[PDB]
């Protein structure tokens, strides 16, 4: 465009012939030098905001930078702008990391080696350790946890559209037999091809570099899997554990293997529970409605032994308790030398609630919640009104804990609180 607009006039001014090749080449060399200069100035907005739309320009930039001074100027300019804007504690930590990882992938595309990423890394980590919630939210971002679990114990709002965006970036994955031996030995051996490494192309490894030790990372990973393997594995975390195992083994400390061992035991515990249950339903003909899981107490980090309050000894329904005891007795028969303990705070039950008006409500409730609602089960169709003191004695549950359990059914529209007594709502005068 510039040549078509001014070159003829410039050649007329100079008087040199229009076809001066060397002059045009030097002009072209100045243009690309100017293009390098401008992009260096704007590299922050290029990588932070315009990415990935400007990623094509980055490839063009990669064709231009040749000297070590260019890289140093780029990174020192980029770190200057980043810390000027992003490293403010006033910026939300969620968006800060989101823009951070956006820069990481941008520079990785720009720099396959990733040495600049290492330099950017080493400069930026102390600021990350300055923020406190970063570890929790990032690992939750790693495992793609639902927002409901996030909102349960995190007291600051988390931007959902950021969460989806970081998830999408995280899941981005764009990052004759004797004659051939003579040819390949000529084609492979005659065709002449003209602080540790820490510059691996994996973005997740860069993310792992935040922690001074991966021990906390793998420890928290154990906690979340032990939680999830309870609530039920999702395939999405199988990739996560595969990744976490992959780098840790490659590096190889004692505690790292301690938190690396039982994760497959959890898989083994679920696998054995799936297998032992099938053999069990075949041998003694138990109720096929029950699906028990046999877990290794030491490795699930489940503190059944917290030795101080008398409060988990709630009574299960007689029919359900008898069926569960049958499993424990014959487990001792199938596996001699082992005793089976039912974790009463632990478990999920699907119950179907049938009302007099024809409404059927199917919910997944805990063992404690099923025990409370079973107290209102009327075999003789008589309306059961139970006071708080009566329910506490029958179920051996503390009153404050009972109120929370009873509030759950009230919110579900099952129980109604009238004058201190809880009664079943049998007839709803409002469209379901």
């Amino acid at each position: 465009k510039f040549i078509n607009q001014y070159w003829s006039q410039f050649s007329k001014l100079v008087g040199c012939p229009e076809d001066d090749h060397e002059l045009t080449t030097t002009v072209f060399n100045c243009f690309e030098s100017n293009f390098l200069r401008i992009r260096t100035n704007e590299i922050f907005d290029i990588c932070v905001l315009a990415y990935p739309d400007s990623k094509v320009t980055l490839l063009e930039l990669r064709k231009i930078m040749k000297d070590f001074k260019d890289y140093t100027n780029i990174v020192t300019t980029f770190l200057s702008d980043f810390k000027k804007y992003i490293l403010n504690p006033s910026v939300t930590t969620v968006d800060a990391l989101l823009r951070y990882v956006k820069t990481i992938k941008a520079f990785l595309v720009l720099d396959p080696t990733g040495r600049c990423l290492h330099s950017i890394t080493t400069f930026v980590k102390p600021y990350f350790q300055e923020r406190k919630h970063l570890v929790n939210v990032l690992l939750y971002a790693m495992l793609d946890l639902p927002e409901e679990e996030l909102k349960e114990k995190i007291n600051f709002n988390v931007d959902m559209k950021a969460l989806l965006s970081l998830v999408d970036t995280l899941h981005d994955s764009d990052i004759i037999r004797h004659a051939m031996l003579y040819e390949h030995i000529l084609n492979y051996y005659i065709a002449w091809v003209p602080k540790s490494s820490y510059i691996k192309t994996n973005l997740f490894e860069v993310l792992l570099d935040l922690f001074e030790s991966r021990e906390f990372f793998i420890s928290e990973f154990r906690n979340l899997l032990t939680d999830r393997l309870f609530t039920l594995l999702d395939e999405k975390w199988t990739r996560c554990l595969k990744l976490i195992r992959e780098k840790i083994v490659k590096f190889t400390a004692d505690a790292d293997q301690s938190n690396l061992n039982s994760i497959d035991v959890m898989l083994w515990d679920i696998k054995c529970s799936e297998e032992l249950c099938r053999k069990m339903h075949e041998v003694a003909g138990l109720d096929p409605i029950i699906f028990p899981k046999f877990i290794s107490l030491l490795y699930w980090k489940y503190n059944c032994d917290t030795q101080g309050s008398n409060d988990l000894a709630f009574h299960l329904p007689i029919d359900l308790e008898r069926e569960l005891q049958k499993y424990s007795d014959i487990y001792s028969q199938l596996k001699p030398g082992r005793k089976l303990q039912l974790c009463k705070d632990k478990g999920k039950v699907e119950i179907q609630l049938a009302f007099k008006d024809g409404r059927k409500l199917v919910l997944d409730v805990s063992l404690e919640q099923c025990s409370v609602i079973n107290q209102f089960d009327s075999p003789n169709d008589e309306p059961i009104c139970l006071s708080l003191e009566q329910l506490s004695e029958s179920l051996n549950i503390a009153p404050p804990r009972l109120t929370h359990l009873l509030d759950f059914w009230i919110q579900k529209g099952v129980l109604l609180k009238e004058n201190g007594t809880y009664s079943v709502i049998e007839h709803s005068e409002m469209d379901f």
Binding site: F230, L232, N261, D264, V265, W268, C272, I289, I290, F291, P292, K293, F294, I295, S296, L297, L298, Y299, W300, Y302, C304, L320, E323, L324, Y327, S328, Y331, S332, K335, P336, G337, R338, K339, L340, Q341, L342, C343, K346, G347, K348, V349, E350, I351, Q352, L353, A354, F355, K356, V362, L367, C370, I373, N374, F376, D377, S378, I384, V424, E426
Partner: protein
């Protein structure tokens, strides 16, 4: 109101029943419910054994200890001849394995003149 139970997903925890900070193997110092350093999975893959001296070890820890020439077939905790306690179903699957290792080593001490 009628309550119908459609499906039950219960969680059970298994632990070793020991015929009574001490629920640890005296050889590997790992928990009985845990794995020895040579085993990965607990339970069947790292079973426990109880000797006549009432000392508990992982199956592989004591077997490895008994396979050493310096052990002389004696318990590492009490120096008594290690023999699996009879009548315990936990020991039933390992009786033949431990009788052989104690017998072979007893023959080796006779052959070595000690």
């Amino acid at each position: 109101m009628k309550v119908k139970i459609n499906e039950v997903h219960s969680v059970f925890a298994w632990s070793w029943h020991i015929p009574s900070d001490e629920d640890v193997c005296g050889i590997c110092r790992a928990s009985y419910n845990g794995t020895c350093p040579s085993c990965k999975f607990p339970g069947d893959q790292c079973p426990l054994v109880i000797g006549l001296c009432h000392h508990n070890f992982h199956d592989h820890c004591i077997y490895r200890w008994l396979d050493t020439p310096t052990s002389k077939g004696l318990c590492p905790m009490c120096r008594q001849t290690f023999q699996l306690q009879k009548g315990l179903a936990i020991n039933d699957a390992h009786v033949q394995k431990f009788v052989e290792i104690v017998s072979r080593r007893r023959e080796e001490m006779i052959e070595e003149g000690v």
